[model samples]
Target chain A: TDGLIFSPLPQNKNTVVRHYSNEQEMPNLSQMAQRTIDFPTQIVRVSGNLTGLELSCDDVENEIDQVFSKKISPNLFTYNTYVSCGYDVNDPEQHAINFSIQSYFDPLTDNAVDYLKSYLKEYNGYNLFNTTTLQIENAKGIIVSMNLNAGLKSNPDKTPFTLYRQDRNNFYFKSNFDVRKELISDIYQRFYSNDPDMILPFFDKWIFSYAGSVYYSILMASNYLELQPERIFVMENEGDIFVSDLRYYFANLCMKRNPNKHCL
Target chain B: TDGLIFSPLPQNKNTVVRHYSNEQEMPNLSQMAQRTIDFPTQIVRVSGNLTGLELSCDDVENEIDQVFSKKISPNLFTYNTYVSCGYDVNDPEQHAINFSIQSYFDPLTDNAVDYLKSYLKEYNGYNLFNTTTLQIENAKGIIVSMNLNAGLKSNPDKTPFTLYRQDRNNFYFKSNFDVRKELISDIYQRFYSNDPDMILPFFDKWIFSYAGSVYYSILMASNYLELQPERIFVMENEGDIFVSDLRYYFANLCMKRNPNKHCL
Candidate 1:
């Protein structure tokens, strides 16, 4: 149940799954209309204690919705379950399991401007700007955005995060996020159990599972992902929550061991 | 008369002289009174073509006063009998000789705030500030001033000039000035004459004569001299006017010839 379920190879059943759909019926101007905008659904297999956990898709959706509701607006968002699956590894009684979760959402209307404004207010002190907007009839629409690095904004530091522009139909809000500390503590209790040897194995599966959820949240919020990621790694510990390329994470580890090594 | 007249040793009779004077009469507030302030006079020997130059003390005073007048003010400053010395340097004809000049000045009244404001305006767009002022009635007085590297103010550059403070009675205006082009051309005609053999000996004397005047200017402006200069060299060619430590100039020359050499 636990080895790399999301394979890099295209022929593998667990490679990746993406789903996207849109409503095509033209709304009647005479009547009040409701529009549904769908984001691509992402599915990845996760292993460990999550198997046979009796978790409801509605509960997970509600939890995620609450985060956005607090940071954004509650009335504009609603979750829709696209597809989901779960199975036991060998001992279902002991919580050895694997699962796949895929979900998407709608804004209940076409105007993203209101949603974006709410989202920007979360990072009040950061230099975030809505640089551009575009709307195409029956085709697509987008809001382009940019922000300076949150860490270096107050100090004399140099790190350039240029524009994050991908598809013309999607908006981009590139920023750093703190990993949920409660989730880390929960995993520590269930999987690692204070054993150092249990940690890596837990992380290997966790990356494709809960980590995938975090990644999906970022994508849903930004409406796009980096076309070419410099690195893709999740950095988690007691007090840190950073996710970037695995190579960057490994380089930092190497530099820590050999201080003379100028990894930068 | 044409050699280095100001020997660096104490036994040399041509070594610089110091003078100090003060008014003994105390002015009464009841009657219309005039107060007098005195600044030290600086004198140095020179050679090459400037010797036997029948230059009046008024001529030199007027020249320096004009520079401050154009850059600062006209009526706020006056020149005293701060200089008086000259001698023939092997040639009284063709004005190819050397001489000595010395001068200094005091504010017409005890008010230096007006004079400092005028001086600072001359270097507009430059970070020039008077950080401190001190006055001990009939005892001493001083003004502490500082200027950042002029290049960085107008553009992106890095060079540090911390602070320059001297006796309240002394004013410091140390700045780089271009070498007199006509003098360099004159030396080229008399000494160089397109002959490599004629140059070194000419430079030996010229370094003390023409270079002496440039040195004198720096000394007067700074109100002091570098006790042990890292390099005491003047660089002059057809189109450039530069003065720096002799070692730095030679190192630059060495680097120019051998591009690979790390002169520093």
Candidate 2:
């Protein structure tokens, strides 16, 4: 009951994802969601004290729900959201909080994956997205595995949550962009000057307008996520690695439309 | 009757906006919507061949509606949308197409201004927005004064409609950003590792999440606008300057949030 408390991956299970590079193909979104999930129904898995001085199982779960509501968004998942905490075995007093985001659910109705699919179709987005969603839907669940320690004098393992506004880290990413820019470089010699007369039929004039908006949403969301390091916690690596294939999928979508921060 | 056919502004009217660097701020959203008005009720103004091989008044007005539906969205402005086109008096052979997007109307029941204000309050957006929208609501109408040439070889005046998807110019803006990067640098060591026990109440954890989403929307929309040169048409600049203070206002907001493609 000690180490096992709050663990959703059964008495034993493991998974991984790398959001930074396209190379880490092993535990991709498709692979992780496709895992065999076997676990007890109860939310709390570990028996040790939560890192917070007087936090209870109730408090941890509540905060996790807040994260789901504000950060993760509501109803993107079919399963009731949850959290489990326990002390790390290697470091006796070290504590870890593992929150699980439920990805797939019955009647499907609409989950995170479905929204991804709908946006792709509704916006006439890139073809790469089609196969990406197809593979992700096969997965069973999405878990954000965070390892937290409370008492450290300095958090060597601490990853800054960059998404927060006025984040100092923001400049490092925003350094390259500007408010004023030219619509076309001299490089683009071919302009649509042919048919001032052919002002376009209904479909042709706005073919990708909806899709462009969707892509724009993806870019903005990706930028916000880039400011935070919690994105790395899902796949559970030592330092920052955007493990949620879902998160990176969003970043990837931005690149397809047009590169911005973290897009290229 | 011929010249005034589709015009919404009084037969005697004018306005302007610049989406680029803060200069040329005359005829801002507030100023344009604030103007005096007089006009014929019909939706067609000029009576020339619409430049399209054999286009008529119906074809031009119809094309304008499509732009409103997809690009401008279904119901942002209060007034019924319309278009007024005519030959440029100076360059009579060069046909000019004018599309008017209605901004303010009675009942004020959720017009473009209202939506802008709501997003400001809901997301806790920048204070600069308050005065900005205040001036915009004062305007009489927003006219996209596009000067088009139905038939021109090597169209010198051609401003690239950059917004359509897969436009080649995306890279110029995206050049500085990349997917892989560290969350923090040695330059700034301050981190929000405080409140170790104080993991925050529900109110504190998510104050800006909603605002961040809205800003993301702003940034995304602004980027899409950058691709299309039509934005400059409203202010009627020589070329490629983003007009539509509403459009640039959206761009300015991205700067308040964080830099990506265009902010700093």
Candidate 3:
């Protein structure tokens, strides 16, 4: 079907044609809801400097298994981790094994990476990243390129499918950080390092951030990252954490809170 | 009336206080639907160079009335025109009259301001700005401040209530430019001139463009504007007009096109 907007303006009786659109056809209801379950609602991908850390993929997984097994819900949340080791990132010769640990999560109620990063800082495991013993100030925050010895590239990460920022990271857990408000306090801290805006490390994507609505992650490539530096947003006041761009948050609120919310 | 994510990771049963949220409550459906009608869906505000044009506020209103009278549908759109003549922006000396004509539109399918600006260029009434014969290149854009001669401040705009960029400029018009495809061609062009990115003309905000989804405008004060210059997104290719920040737009689509779309 099509639609036409034929309102007459007062321009000397000129019939200015405003809107005439063939409605982009859509299916009925149930199908739409079915698709929403798969829509990438929350997504974050993280990769940063672990170059000289002496950590293996197994260590990385073991740590995360501990964190998510306790922090993430299997019914309402989704998460993934990848860690590798390699002879050289720039070399082209076939190496036996290599891996870089990165993670993805949806309904990212909190920057889950913090769970791992902080857990590491508090525990005795991965001391390579000890806040006191760390030396790499400049680390890549996201993967924005790819390359081989023969070709110049930003070797972001390799997974079976394309990663999207909005992809809810597989919808692993439901929003519950609401219970452990203090848990989110970790989120309130800015991760507290004065990381220059847009000045990212070539191999660091340990960048974590919130854009008021949902949280997103960066790849270890050349990507311009927006670090929301507002203190209240990053600080825990218990009053509120600040924003999700009202209009957007309102839209989501509309449907869930309403019955005939089809006008969305 | 709350949701909790209590997923236990495979790590020694160490329970993580992840998500424990008391769901924010909501009303029934029809009420929700009713509220959607009032949601500001699209909005844009425009203000810029009118200095030394020898044009009065009346001239501006008459011009706009002619444009919207023809280009905008009174039934589906909402627009407000304000023009005032004042003596000085910085001095307390109260002389007489001064006005700045600015406009706002929702579901801004095409920038309504352009329709007005272009209509002026085509008509025989106001020639102070002939595109080729204009002297004032710097005009103010969005109003982000206000000052009373005594107060050292930014004079954004003076209106009854607060104005927001995403307020949808009060939900006027439904999208229909599909009729006259050429109309959007104006939008297709960068509106085109090379204005530096994020750089504002202290007194100019004659900026117009898109961000892949909806179209918005700025005021004549100090406000950073993003002029989407991806030639294709701004050009008349007609395959598709680029984006609306996919995830956000998708959320809106989910509710409108899907029954049981409440999942949004």
Candidate 4:
């Protein structure tokens, strides 16, 4: 309506947060559950432009389930979880998005202690079992669980709809693509080839030693917003997709410790 | 008896402020009751180590008068004037040194409106109709005038005879010399070499701007506690007589209008 307009500070009225958790390890499934658990599957949300959509947290989780999966087991011991949904005013119907993530532990579970030991062995090479849990806890402890919520919508202010429309052409390019493999390929390409002077041995120490950790985390869990699921529009500068994707992914990764920016 | 000496704080604690007015017209000393005129002068408090002493504001005025007569008035404020003094704690007999100075104001003061108009001008210009009186006023503008108390007694552990001997030395050195002139000459020689790459210019802009001003006031206001004449030991760096003198003079000069470093 306003020449593909986009603005920050969304209308505060129509926004909701969702929560979910796993009570049992695994149980039953439908097409939705299969889509969510299946590897190489991409989850995305589109915004509906309106001040009051009357969407609740449960409504958002249900919407995500419609595209991805539904809970296989009920009454899971959810340690903690949160999710959210919103609509963009600029492109009302075509831009609604939903988000959901959760974590849990059974009553007899020692996931926190076990994860801490595993993380220490994998990340910080030190035998934690021989040491007292209190001492190990004091020295180090792994995260109990993690919850995530994120979504995406068009940013016409950044580029015109004509440019964004091209992304539809590239959607099928990743049918069998594992984002983890893509992450590694992109990182190596950018860090190594981007500057020929940065040889492999040197790259190993600088890029591999530090940025490798971040890359690994992204492979494990990344909400690639730049790879929009709904091909509403294609970005004119194809490189913008990669750049924006990396930026969005890294920003969220950093916010893992500070959820105010990443989660909220 | 134990080697001990004791003295109480003075009743008339000296809290003198020095002021100078621009020479709107040289005060025709020969003319009295000629015209009712208001000549503005800037008041500055002595700070640093030589803040208090038996010296009165008039004694400070006298030193300034000497500087103006010797270096400024005779040469149109071309040469700088300075003063320094200290209070003796161990010796009851020593007098403080009073220093004064007059020269072109520092260029930096031009931007400091109140400081420039009030203190800097008074120090550099001779006013005909201005008569300055010194008294301590709190932030609320309550006047409290007092004399400098006897500060320290020469090494309290020393025997009375040794203390008396030190007291005699303090009395003569504090009162005898023209410390202000001597110190100003030293600072001028140290700082005013016109070498293109010399450090003096940088020192003036950064360090001496404050040091010279504060030293000048402390040196000039010092007086003998016994005879109640200006003394020189009021300054902390009793060795660097010239630096100390310039410091007090400049400090008090500025203190009149703006007591803080940030005049604005």
Stretches of candidate 4 exceeding 4 Å from the true structure = A1-15, A18-45, A50-53, A69-83, A86-179, A182-202, A205-264, B1-264
Expressed as tens digits, the lDDT of each residue in B53-143 for candidate 4 is 5554455556555634332232122112223233343345433323222222211122233333443345443431133322111111111
Which ten residues in a row are the worst by lDDT in model 1 chain A? A145-154
Tell me the spans in candidate 3 whose CA falls farther than 4 Å from its real position: A1-264, B1-46, B69-71, B78-264
Ranking by DockQ: 2, 3, 1, 4
Kindly list the per-residue Cα lDDT of model 1 for residues A131-183, writing each as its tens digit: 11111011011111111000111111221211111110111111111011222
TM-score order of candidates, top first: 2, 3, 4, 1
DockQ of each: 0.01, 0.03, 0.02, 0.00
User: Which portions of model 2 show Cα errors greater than 4 Å?
Assistant: A1-99, A102-246, A249-264, B1-49, B52-93, B97-245, B248-264
Stretch of 10 with least lDDT, candidate 2 chain B: B171-180
How well is each residue in B1-264 modelled by candidate 2, as lDDT tens digits? 100011112232221211111111211333334323321111111122333233333444455444322333323322222244443344434433332333212111235444545533543222221211111222211212111111111222332212111110000010000100111110011111112122112112221212233333332433222111111111111111122212211111222233443221
Please tell me what DockQ candidate 3 reaches: 0.02
Q: What is the lDDT of residue B15 in candidate 3?
A: 14
Whole-model lDDT values for every prediction: 0.23, 0.22, 0.24, 0.25
Across the candidates, what are chain A's individual TM-scores? Answer: 0.21, 0.19, 0.22, 0.24
How many backbone clashes can be found in candidate 4? 90
In order of appearance, the predictions have TM-scores of 0.15, 0.22, 0.21, 0.16
lDDT of 3 by residue, B1-264 (tens): 011111111211111111111111111233222322222222222234555555544554455446433454433333322333333333343322333333232222234434444544664233333322211111111111110000111221321111112211111112222111222222222222123232222112222123221121222221211121110011122111211111111011112222432211
